[PDB]
């Protein structure tokens, strides 16, 4: 219903039809210069990862760390 977001500034409020918060970690094509990309938010269900994507899902307000 509310999740932590990538940025501390954006609204924790989830779009209607979610109570799954997620933490998504992966190497994009800048991984060698910048490190892994990180994304926090809401999903309808635990999102379907592609190869190499670390993912952690939880279902309580602002649980995604």
């Amino acid at each position, epitope marked *: 219903r509310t999740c932590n977001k*990538t*940025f501390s*500034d*954006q609204s924790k409020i989830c*779009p209607p039809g979610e109570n799954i918060c997620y933490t998504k970690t992966w190497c*994009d*094509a*800048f991984c060698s*210069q*910048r*490190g*892994k*990309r*990180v*994304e926090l938010g809401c999903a309808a269900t635990c999102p379907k990862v*592609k190869a190499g994507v670390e993912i952690k899902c939880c279902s309580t307000d602002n649980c995604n760390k």
Partner: antibody
Amino acid sequence: EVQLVESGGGFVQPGGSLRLSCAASGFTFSNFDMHWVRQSPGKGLEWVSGLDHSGGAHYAGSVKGRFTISREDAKNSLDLQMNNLRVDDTAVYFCVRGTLYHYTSGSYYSDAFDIWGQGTLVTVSS
Amino acid sequence: EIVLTQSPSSLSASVGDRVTITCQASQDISNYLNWYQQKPGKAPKLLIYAASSLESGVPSRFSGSGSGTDFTLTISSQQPEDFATYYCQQANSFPYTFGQGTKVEIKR
């Protein structure tokens, strides 16, 4: 829902001025690099102007000294003031959000243009 | 300024065909190169950033490669919804520039 909605489109005489505006919604506007991209009928895309989250302004050579880009963070608005307009400035103008990607190493701005408004037409004609 | 030249400007594909579009940059742009799709009457949509990284929601049949001056967009199986204009764009240095666009049309 992330929305960029352009307004201020219309017709203007050559040598005339026209202010475009963009109402942003569903993100923390003040944190984002914002851009203007235009497209002449039947032709391709041209970057016009960018304004960084930190206030630095960037203009394409064709528009430098004629166009002024600005933001009002409080009103979630981006403006483009166009002056000394010529026929060849006739285009659909798109409001565009520069990406803001987060890594262990920090924040990176305007790697790409992830959100496009549906664009407003500006016709410069006598 | 950095000029991007796409090839071809138009290509004919059948549904199922593997489609390749080249982007050549007039100077080294590392991997700061993006691919956009545009349909008629509609705004461009980001497919690929950093020369080979897919944007969220983009189907896996889109793939990108290259660095320096030499870049390639691949659609591994052309679908009905993929008949569209594709643009490359460099985010290496101001002013940001686009290739001239590649129109993918139906072969017959």
